[PDB]
Assembly symmetry: D2
Homo-oligomer: 398 residues x 4
C-alpha cells in the first residue's frame, strides 16, 4: 500500500544502496576500481574536476568509484548526508580532528578513550597548541560547566573502549547546539545497525571499520559520516593533505562485502553475548560483570534508550587476582588471546597480564583496570561451545 | 659480496623454506594476531618479543616490503604506508613541533606544498623556501629553529636538482634532519642516503608500483628515526596503514623495477632529443640533455636521467591545450611512473582556475607540459607527440 | 564435536602455526620450492607432508577443503574453479566407455549438456530415472551401472530424492552415488550422512554467498577424492581454484549458518504469500504443507531452503511481464547471493525453443524461479506484489 | 599497427569507456543481470553482444583474451584456470572416439598423462611422431587424423618442430594444428603466423612472469575458439579463470617484452658459460651455434629463450650434488618466474622411478633444467659455478 517514498529496510540498503547493475554492464557485484589515476577526454574536462565544476574522478587519494559506493552506503546506514573511507579507524579520527582543530581551540573529551586515540590527542595534536580537557560525558551538568568560548569539538566514544561507559548523545548535542561546538562520536562498538548518533544530533561519526563493519578481521579501514560540508572539508584537507590515509579499493570492496551481512552478524554477536553475560553473572568465580544488557549495568537505562541491542562486548572481574586471570586466559581453547573486536572469532584480553603487563598493580588502578579484569569480544561461534570454553577456563582460574 | 640490485629486488629478506616452500610470500591479509600465552602477548606491547599484534603497527607482508626497500635504498629500516602523502605527513608530524622550522626546496609537489602551508604550517611550524642547489643561500637560511631540510630532487616543474651531499654537510653542522623525496628516481637511479640524507620518502604509487593500480608510500632511514615515525606518525597521527594486498602488488612491481626504469629512461631520452629540436618547443627540461643547466650534478647523483620530461610550447596556453587534446596514445592525467605514458599541462588542468600571474608566481609557464614517458614502443610515442605538436599550431 | 558455526569459522586452522595470524595468510603462489632434491622426490612419490604445485594442491585450498569436509561430515575435500569443474572432474574420473550412469530426471542445464553432448559422446551410456520412485530406480539398475548422479532438490519443481533410499539400492548393486548438494549446502542437508559416496557443489552459490567468485567443491572419502584430484582435476580438466577466490569462499562460509537462516525465513514468508495470490497457478516450495514431498523434505533437510519455483496462470507472457517488472529482484541466472534473483526459463534460457520443445524438456510456460535473498522481507514482498500486478 | 609493447599495455582498452580509469576495473562478479528477459534470451540464443555468467564470459577476461589474441596475431582468445585447462578444453572439444591425434615425440608430463590416461581411454587414438621429420609426419597421416598437437621447443632437448612444414601437411589432410607456445610466448614466436590453427599457453609461466597465478590461454580462429569456449570450457572442464587472476595476468603481460629480453640475455650468458665447463656432458640451448636445430630455431624464434637443459658427467649423483648446492636458484618445478628455478628430474619429479624407464624416455640421469630468472647475471654465474664444483 504505502508507496515509493518509504525508506527501504536496513538490510536492503546494506546490500543495494547506491548501486544499480545496469550502470556497470549488468555486473551484480560492482567492479573494483583498483586504479590510482583517472584520465580526461579533454583538457577542459580535467580543469573542471580540479576547479569544482564537473562531477568526476582524477586521483584515488582524493576520490574513487569503489570508495564512493562504500561511502554513500555507510552514509545511508548512519542517516548522514555524506561518507568518507580511510585506511584505518585512526585515519578517520586523525583526518577529522586535524581538519576541525587549530592552535587555541579546545577539544572536550570523554573520560576514557581508545588508547591510540588518547595518544593522538595527548602526544600528537595536543602538542601542536590544541587544548584538551576530559569531562564525564554522562554528567550533562558537568559538560555544560566545562564549555568555554574556545571549545570547538566535543569528541567521545559511546559505549567507550574498554569500560563501556556511555553518554547521552542527544543531551550532548543539545548543549553543543546552544554553545556552538561540533560533536564527533566514535560509533565503532555499536555500528549504525545498533545506534545512529547523527540521528540523535551528532555532527560527525567515525568508525574503525576494521571491527564489526568488516566483521571478518581481514582489513584495516576507517569511515567518517556527516554533513556534506564537513565530510568534504575532511576529505580535501585531513585526508588529502594531512594524513594520506587512503583506503585500498580492494579493501573497500571487502568492507562492502562484510556490510552485506552486518545485521545478521550483529544479531548473533548480541544474542551470544547476552547468553554469555547471563551465564557469567551466575558463576562463583565472577565478582563483577559489565554488560549493557544486564540490569546491573551502571547505565542500563541509557543503554536501552540509545542502543537497539546491547552489543557483543563483555567486561568482567574474576575472583583471585592476576593469577586467576592468567590461568583463565591460558586455559581458553576456543576464544583467542588477542586485541581487536568485532571479528567472527571470539577474542579475549586480560589487561593485567597482556596490554598493561609492564605496569605494577598501583598504576593500573588509577587508569581503572582491576587485576582480575577481562574484556571479551563475543564472536559468531556456537554459544554452547563458547559457554563450555568459558566454563572450563573458569575452573582452571580457581 | 652484496648481491646485485635486481637480485635484491626479487629476493631480499625472503627464504621460501620459512613459509612452507612458497616461492611467492603468502599475503598476511589479517588485522590481528593472537598469542599462545598472555606472557607472549605482554612482551609484544612492551617490545621484547619479536612478533606481531596489530597490522596498523606492523604486519609480516609489510615487513618484507619494508626490509626490501631498505636494502634497495641502502638504509637501516623501512616503513610502508597507505600513500606517498602518508609517508610525508607521518615523517613530518613526527619530526616537527611548534616553533621548529622546515627549510624547503623552492618547488614542491602540490599536495606536499598544501600540507606544509595549509596543514602543519597552521599549527605553528615555520616554513622557509630556499634554492637547494645554492649552498651559500642554504647555509645563510639556517637558523637555530631549523630542524628539517626537505626537498625533491629532481623537483617539478623544471627538474631542478639539489646537491644532496652539499646539503647534508650543512645540515650536519646544525644537527638538522635531511629528508629527500626520491619518488622520481627510485633507489635504482639515486640513493640519497648514500649521499648523506637521513631519510627518504616515496610515493610508491608511481614507479615502484609501476602499474598504476595501487596507492602506497615508503619511508627509509635509520632504525631510530623510522621507529619513531612508525610509533608516532603512523600509529597515532595519520593511521595511513597500507593494505597487505597492495603491499604484495608493490613487491610484485619492484621485481621489475630495474627493467622498467631502463625502458622509461631509454624512451624519454629519445623523446627529449626529438622535442629539443622542434620549432613549437621554446624550452625543454630533461636531465639527459647536454644543455640541462645542472647536467653535471645530475650525473653525479643519478645513474640515468629518468622517465620525466617537462617542456614549454611557444604558443603558450592555447598551444598547450591543443597539444594535450590531440594526444591519442599518451593519456591526459595526473600521476606518473605507470606503464602507460601520461601527460599534463598545468595551465589548463591542475592550475586552470588561476590567472596567468598566479601561475608565474608559483613557477608554472603558460606552455609548460609534463610527460611521464611510459613503456610503449618508442615509434608509437614519437608518432603521437609529432601529430600533437602539429595540432598545437 | 564443535557446533556447525564454530567449525565453519575455525575448523582446520590454528593461528599459532602461522605467526599468530587470526585470518590465514593467502598462499597466492603457483609453485613451492624444496630444501633438497630428495625432499622434493618424496612429495612427487606421495609419502611426504608438503607442497610442490598449486594445480595439484595449495595450503589455502587445503584449509578450504578440510573445512568443507568437516561441514559435510566427510573425510576429504577438493576445491575447483567452478561447480562444473567439480562435476566434470568427478565424472571424468569415475566413468569409462561401457559404464552406465543413472541420472535424476532433471538436471542443471550445463550438467545436462556435459552428460549428453560431452562425456556421453565418449561411449558412456546415460539413462534418466525418477530418483523419487525407488521401485523404478531398482528396476533400472544393471551390473554396468557405475554411478548414480542427481540433485536434491532439483530444478524445476524442487523435486527430491530419498538419498538413504537411493544409497540402499546403490549398496545392493555396487554403484557410486554422487549428489549435487548446491541448493541445500551442508548446513541444511548432508548426503554423505545418508549414504552418498560423494557430494558436489557449485560454491559460486550459497557457500560464497556474495556473488563475487566462481568455485566448486567435492567432498567424500579420501580414496575417491584423491583419485578425483590426481586424475580428473590434474589431468582431465585443469579446473584449478585461485587461492584469492578460495580465501573469499572461506570468508563467505564464516556466515553460512546466519545467511541460510535468513534466506529460509525470507523464502518461507514469500512462498506463503505467493500461495495466496490470484496470479499464481501453482507453487513449489518445500516449506509449504502442499509440497508433494513435504514429509521427505522435513526428514532430509533441516530447513526448506531459499529457492522458490512457481507458475503464473498467464503462461509465458505473464512470466515475461512479471520478470520485466521486478525492481529489487534482479533478472539473472545464478542463485544463493545476498541479492534476490529471478529467472523465467521460457523467456530467458530457453526462449528460442517452441512451447512443445520446452514441455518435452520439462519447463512450464509460466515457471519462474526465485532465489530469495537477504533483503528486508517487506521490501521483497512489495516488489513481488507489484510485479504480479504487472504480470496481467 | 602499434608495436608489441604498445599493444601489451593498451590493446582493447580505452579509459574513457570505464569512467576514465587508467587501469581497467576488475569485474569480480559471478553473474550479470539483464535489463529485460528478452535481452537475457538473446544472450542464451546464439548472439553475445553483452554478458550473462562469468564461466561463459566476463569483461576482465574478455580484455585479457583480446590482448592475447592481438599479441599472437589471432582472431580470438580464451582465458582458463590453468594451462592444463587450456589443453584439455581444446582437445575435448576437437576430438571424439575414432579420431586420431598426432603428437610431438615428447610432451609435458601432465599433457602426456591427459592424452594417455585421460582422453586416450575414451576411444581417441594416439600416435607420437617427430614433428621436425616432415616425411615421417606425412607417413603417419590417416583419414582419421583430426588434430596435430606439439610443443616447440619441447622438453627435454628443446627439440624444435617445423611449424610451417607441419601446417602445410595438416591443411592438405584437413587436420587442426595446435601448438603449445608456453616457452617462447608471443613475444618470441607466433605459431599462428606460421600456419598453426590454435595456440595454447600455460600463462602460469612467462606470461604471468611472477609465479603468483595459475592460468591458461587459447588463441586461434573465432570459429575454433567459440567452440572451445562453449563446449570444452562451459561443459567439459569448467576451468574458469578468476577475474582477480586475469587482472594479475594482464599486469604481468605489460612487462613481457622487458622480462623476456632479460631472461634471454641471462640464459645466453649462462649457456655460453656452461658450454665451457668440464662437468657438463652436453647442453641444449637454442642460442649456441652447436645447437642441432640452430637455423630452424632462428627462423621461428626471435630470441633463443630463457630455458637451458644440460647433462652433467656423473649422472644422478652429480645432479643431486649440483641441485642441493644451489643457493640462489630454487629447487622447484615450473618456469618463467622472476626467480631462477632448477630441477633435476632423475632426483625430483621422476625420482620414485627406477633408472630403467627413464632411459627410453628423454630423461637422462644427469639432465638438469634451468629456468633462468631476472636476477643479476653475476650472482647467477657465481651460484652455478659453486654448484658445479660441488657436483664433482
Ligand atoms: C573504538 C575504536 N576507535 C578506533 C580504533 C582504531 O581503529 P584502527 O585504526 O582501524 O585500528 C579502535 C581499535 N580498537 C582495537 C585496537 C586493536 S590494536 C582494540 O582496542 O581492541 C577502536 O576500538
Ligand atoms: C548460472 C548457473 C546456475 N547453476 C549452476 C549450477 C552448477 C554449475 O556451477 P558453476 O557455475 O560452474 O559454478 C552446478 N550445480 C548446480 C545445482 C547449479 O545450479 C543457475 O541455475 O542459475
Ligand atoms: N605527482 C603526480 C600525481 C599526484 S596527483 C602529479 O602531480 O601529477
Ligand atoms: N612445465 C612445468 C610444470 C609445472 S607443474 C615444469 O616442467 O616444471
Ligand atoms: S546457466
Amino acid at each position: 500500500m504505502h508507496g515509493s517514498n518509504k525508506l527501504p529496510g536496513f538490510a536492503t540498503r546494506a546490500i543495494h544502496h547506491g548501486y544499480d547493475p545496469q550502470d556497470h554492464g549488468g555486473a551484480l557485484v560492482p567492479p573494483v576500481y583498483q586504479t590510482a589515476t583517472f584520465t580526461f577526454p579533454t583538457v577542459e574536462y580535467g580543469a573542471a574536476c580540479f576547479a569544482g565544476e564537473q562531477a568526476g574522478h582524477f586521483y584515488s587519494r582524493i576520490s574513487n568509484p569503489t570508495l564512493n559506493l562504500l561511502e554513500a552506503r555507510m552514509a545511508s546506514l548512519e542517516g548522514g548526508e555524506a561518507g568518507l573511507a580511510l585506511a584505518s579507524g585512526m585515519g578517520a579520527i586523525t583526518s577529522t580532528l586535524w581538519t576541525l582543530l587549530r592552535p587555541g581551540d579546545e577539544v572536550l573529551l570523554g573520560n576514557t578513550l581508545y588508547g591510540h586515540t588518547f595518544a593522538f590527542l595527548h602526544h600528537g595534536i595536543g602538542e601542536f597548541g590544541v587544548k584538551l580537557r576530559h569531562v564525564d560525558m554522562a554528567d550533562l551538568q558537568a559538560l555544560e560547566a566545562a564549555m568555554t568560548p574556545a571549545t570547538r569539538v566535543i569528541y567521545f566514544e559511546s559505549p567507550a573502549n574498554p569500560n563501556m561507559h556511555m553518554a547521552d548523545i542527544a543531551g550532548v548535542a543539545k548543549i553543543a547546539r546552544k554553545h556552538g561546538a561540533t560533536v564527533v562520536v566514535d560509533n565503532t562498538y555499536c555500528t549504525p545497525y545498533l545506534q545512529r548518533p547523527l540521528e540523535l544530533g551528532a555532527d560527525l561519526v567515525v568508525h574503525s571499520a576494521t571491527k564489526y563493519l568488516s566483521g571478518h578481521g581481514d582489513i584495516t579501514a576507517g569511515i567518517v559520516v556527516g554533513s556534506q560540508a564537513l565530510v568534504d572539508r575532511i576529505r580535501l584537507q585531513g585526508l588529502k593533505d594531512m594524513t594520506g590515509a587512503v583506503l585500498s579499493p580492494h579493501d573497500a570492496a571487502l568492507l562492502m562485502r562484510g556490510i552485506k551481512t552486518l545485521n545478521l552478524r550483529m544479531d548473533r554477536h548480541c544474542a551470544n553475548a547476552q547468553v554469555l553475560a547471563e551465564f557469567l553473572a551466575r558463576q562463583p568465580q565472577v565478582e563483577l560483570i559489565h554488560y549493557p544488557g544486564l540490569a546491573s549495568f551502571p547505565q542500563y537505562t541509557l543503554a536501552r534508550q540509545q542502543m537497539s541491542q546491547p552489543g557483543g562486548m563483555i567486561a568482567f572481574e574474576l575472583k583471585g587476582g592476576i593469577g586467576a586471570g592468567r590461568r583463565f586466559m591460558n586455559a581458553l581453547q576456543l576464544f583467542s588471546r588477542a586485541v581487536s573486536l568485532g571479528d567472527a572469532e571470539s577474542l579475549a584480553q586480560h589487561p593485567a597480564s597482556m596490554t598493561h603487563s609492564s605496569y605494577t598493580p598501583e598504576e593500573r588502578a588509577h587508569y581503572g583496570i582491576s587485576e582480575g579484569l577481562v574484556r571479551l569480544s563475543v564472536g559468531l561461534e556456537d554459544i554452547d561451545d563458547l559457554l563450555a570454553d568459558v566454563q572450563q577456563a573458569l575452573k582452571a582460574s580457581a
